[PDB]
């Protein structure tokens, strides 16, 4: 998830910690 168009900043790293 990066959607980091300035009014709309959302960023986010969803990995499959530890086997998901």
């Known amino acids: 998830m ?3 168009a ?3 900043g959302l960023g ?3 990995q499959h ?3 998901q």
């Open 12 to 14: 986010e790293d969803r």
């Open 2 to 4: 990066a959607a980091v």
């Open 6 to 8: 300035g009014l709309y």
């Open 17 to 19: 910690r530890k086997k």
